[PDB]
């Protein structure tokens, strides 16, 4: 495990998962506030009302981040804090992020700032949300004030976090807010996310004339055929198209994959929501490429599935989410990206694991989480020996937090959080990560 | 309840028998499915189960002490034809003895021919997807009729073709675990046609008057809202669960709304031959219903069949199923209005809850309450003229609950699967007392 | 025929009027469709047509000499509202004069409001796909009612929504020529709802007793063989052509078998709002039927709607359509058994044949024979109590036959489109004599 | 117009379209005999009972071919003459083809022999025809006796003619025999045709140890988008997949195009009829590549079409089939094939046109057919100047003949045939073609 002196270590969070203060500072509800309150959607109707109370306790968390010695803190800006109503900027909301980023710079920590990490304002939802092509303009007005007020104190920008989740998981499979099950809505939502990404990049580099590094973050889950049958090859292909190529191709090639457009045409009977110039804008050149990586999926064919695939039995070790622990597949992915897609510097903007953490005598001996991270850092190092140019690794997450549809039932943090008292207790993985970074610095 | 109302309790062969490779028994599709990775909870299987093949006398005594009029069980096809065309007298002898012993104790044997244990040899030739499955079943039913018709009180041809057909060949959750809608409609068709042919054989060729019928699981479907989309959703859920089976049996046709919907996958219906539906709808003596719950549903634009489950605020069993006795009543009234005047047996009803053994007892007041509510509904329905002739409580014993393995307990008698000890739960004592109370109300 | 049976003849505005840019008229979807390459035979159009807007007096005299009780015509929406919200008195004056003149000659005006000439301004806002089309139509119907209700004998709201909806927005053969099943179901819905709302307006707001109804083209469907696949095929052809329209109008619902089939393309039905179907099914005074032929169909595994045309050995018209008077009778009997007791007008029936002008005459014995057979069928049906109150012969004049242009002649009067000369075909003389003969049978 | 001395000129026919003698010499009916007799399927129930009576008049036709001066005569062998019943070889049927090819060699004319040109025996149809994987073996037994008895006197072999027609037009669109409309049957039929091709090639080169040149003939119709909209791009893609790539990819890449497998999965819910090794065999190396080329298609998107496309309005000059005259598109095609698919030598195994031929004073002044051929020969010459290696051109057809579902209503011949009397009358295009070949020979 050897990293170039240039390599950045990071840790990451998002606004709705940690901030709390959900109705303070002028903040109006997001699609996730109301989704948490919809029956059946979130584990035990858990919500982000209080979360990690980070809005109030940000100073303490800055100290935790300082003590880790990470070069970089990745966080998101709450859209509903900045534009709590349409066209109505909220200076109090912007002040919190201005302070946050100023304070991080003062402590010598790079702010890596995600603009959209899933907390769409309810007023936007009420007009059709991401399905409405106007969402692109709503997003640009949000990005514009962010750039006006923060570009000078931010180290890098990430436009969108996981449009597969915000698009497909949210509007097709109905597991994430706003919980719809409509493939036409989903492809329109994704398209508008990606186009909003491209336009914000053009805005930053054109009219702001800024050289701040900017890119998108995609979650990528490499897909494997259970057998070598032709059916299972189709299945892998289609799982891969649905999770990965539907996003990679527009961003890097300026095209959607026609094989997936044909498969999606069981629901989507026109593609005229893709206007001339959209794909050129989606593929506007960026400074780096962000990857959230958690696992692979083994799949096989299903004659009864619209998209011709279903999950297959996996015999791998699994995290407490039930996801495969899959570092070799992480390496397959990165090689593929370099062979097929891009030469840009890569940041692993998220990697991490939930395990059934046990608090005993004020400690958390999360050897399982240590083993997970160690394997993936090892893989990064080895990939960097092949010239794969992974510029950095941000560990998800700084803190245990609101894990979406699972609520507080799933802990991804290297720092444990008692959600009653708000106490932070470093897990063994925090102590170990701090040390790994220090060893690299020598 | 009426003086001729029957109280019962129910099991099936693979879920209780064990002795999976004894007495000439060869593997069923469930034996191999249990061994297929990812299909059954912790790869649990029916190798031992409740070891009933060995302990049947003990279980008979349990049945006797319960005071039930009826014991419903199934015949393991792989015990009877362990290979194609090769009858196994030792397998039949177990069932002949079982039924004789029940009669000797004054208990009516209600016998299910097919409760899901298709022989592997049949599966290896295409299973229920193959139209020859009708003849394979017929040969099975024929020898059962030859050897047992004199000793059984009633016959049930098929148990839950929605499960054996759709859950098994379309949704892949039950053996053999396929996910192919064309296989699944062919499978269901052959099961229903096999039922029709078995009833014709019993009444024509055997000239027997033994009551015979089919058992369907029926799950009434409700719309979340009154929007037309949600009405379409309820229509299609109800077609998929219920009407696909009820229409052929009682009307001699398949519902064309569902044929059209299924034509996203099924591009020909020529597997339905001339005469098939006339045979499927051949007249029977009763209609068996397995009832557990309702489903509340709504529309989904991204679903092939236009529906998905909607959130339910009902009290639920340990399966997460709604406790839905009012909906049971809507179901029974609907059947009388739209489908049949035949006498109805509730061939299964019951519940799984998280049973705790404490100081040798099982305080399953939740199961008691579940059953009480449905018995009350039966009684009420019978006051309306709805002619429910009996109720069989699923199940006598905790047993192998399919893809959930031994993790879900439906028994009124607890079974410790390490020791095979039977321990009566509170629900067993209570059920025995409910039957006594009903008998004490009748004039002797 | 009965003493109050009416004989008629029929046209529509765009097919005969001409003067396409005069009198304030702005273009319809057909004007622009005729100019779109590949859509209409030799890019023929309705610029001149039969020049009836100018020659109406001559045509009235022709109608008078025929002796018909009724003349059915349509009102050009682009003459009345040439722009959204801008009423055009000069356009209305033509129709006021026309109807007044018909009355003065003792001829009943049967008036079609929508016969396919949607204004381009409406099309540019989404046409019939837009729910606002209901209000646009309503404003059109309102002024027609205001200005003409006193002078018209009956109203027909819509002519052939299967054509205006499916043939136009799904199969792309008629204006505006789209091929989108979601547009097509929305279009049909808005046409039917517009009908319902217009009838409510006439009877509620205008408090008028003028008879009003809708006109559907209906094409009875037959299976090539008795296989279930061919039965499914006939079911789906009949749903697509007929039941999609009959069920909402007479039953207040859309057929769910067809909703399911159409869900290969249509993934939500929330364009049907609360109240829509109650309004669509509002009671009317008669039911209009345009009848031309049957279709024999069979199954096709490769067709979305599971059917295709089957070979027909029937005698055929110059359109290649079956000559099918027996099937006309099955249709009318079926309507009385399953849908309605309302009086029926045959608002169109007729045929195209390859007419030859020779020495100033047209010997169309083929058209005579076609019409004779259907008139005989009407008479026979009326002896059975089937209550067909009238028959309107399509058409008075050879005219613009849509995507076929002037290449197909349905008139009983021949029109030389170079000179505008009208020449009575043998069928016109014969029809006049048939009406005389019927009048001479009645006691004066 | 200059052709290498090596360039071969040809003319072409097929057995059922010219032979007649339908019930003589032991010949049993083909799927086309019975299709012609099925109501509604063929123009005026025309059939090949007599056709051009070539079975009897072959000597005269050899003389016509001689007089043309063509290097090559392309013809087909009637399967129902060779195996009129399953497993029952018919020496009388083989003798006619042995004589035919011996006589052509004696006159110094290369026989180019098509094995399957659409006349499947009714006994094969009765067992499921090309849908049945056993069709591969039935075909091999036919090919085997052909090779045994004819390889020594044949100049080249063509395994199959237009599997798009024999597969898709015949089993999906129902326009050709046996007239089915079933997409599952169609893809199975095609697959078995292609696999039978590959196996026959392996047989010829392995167990026969023969070096006779062998290849497949595909009809290829290049596809063009009406506009530059994304929808119309999808439409072009799918028209191209359906007509061309579904055949080109297996043959040259050993794969089916997954975009078309996904689109076809509206009807075809499993692809396990493609067994391991099938695609390797389908793509077995061949000596040349045969192209039947007639036209292009301009297409546009349709939301109501399963395969997302429909024909668009064409303003090009058209033949009497209504097909575009499209030589520039012919050149697009050949360039593409060299850029994307193959370097093998190409034979244009069919090119020609039907026009409303007028017989006046014993002549046929078919200037329209001359102009058509001239443009395409010109295009071949120009392509050969770019190094596109078109080794030869066979003009369809030697004779007016039975044009399938159009019967005798469509005349593709350079030699007119009175079908009452059987008289052959050279059209002006015959005289012109003869002369073009002679000019090349100088």
Author numbering:
A (entry chain B), D (entry chain B): 1 to 442
B (entry chain A), C (entry chain A): 3 to 446
From the paper:
β-glucosidases are key enzymes in cellulose depolymerization, acting synergistically with endoglucanases and cellobiohydrolases. Recently, we have characterized a cold-adapted member from Exiguobacterium antarcticum B7 (EaBglA) with higher kcat over mesophilic counterparts at 30 °C141516. Besides being cold-active, EaBglA is also glucose tolerant, indicating that cold-adapted GH1 β-glucosidases might be instrumental to make biofuels production via SSF economically viable. Crystallographic studies showed that the (α/β)8-barrel fold and the catalytic residues Glu162 (acid/base) and Glu350 (nucleophile), typical of GH1 members, are conserved in EaBglA.
The two crystallographic structures of EaBglA, solved in distinct space groups, presented the same tetrameric arrangement. Structural comparisons revealed that the EaBglA subunits assemble in a different way from those of GH1 tetramers available at the Protein Data Bank (PDB), indicating that the tetrameric arrangement of EaBglA is the first of its kind to be reported within the GH1 family. Hydrodynamic studies using SAXS and AUC indicate that the EaBglA tetramer is stable in solution. The tetramer has a 222 symmetry (with a distorted tetrahedral geometry) and two pairs of active sites placed at opposite faces. Each pair shares the same entrance and forms a huge cavity [11393 Å3 ± 216 (mean ± SD)] with a two-fold symmetry. Two types of interface stabilize the EaBglA tetramer (called here α and γ). The type α is a side-to-side interface composed by residues from the helices α11 and α13 and the loops α13/α14 and β8/β9. The γ interface forms a semi-circle wall at the catalytic face of the TIM barrel, connecting the active sites from neighboring subunits. EaBglA crystallized in slightly different conformations, as indicated by the structural superimposition of the independent tetramers observed in the P21 and C2221 crystalline forms. These conformational changes result in variations in the surface area buried into the tetramer interfaces and in the volume of the active sites, suggesting that EaBglA forms a flexible oligomer, which possibly contribute to overcome the structural rigidity imposed by low temperatures.
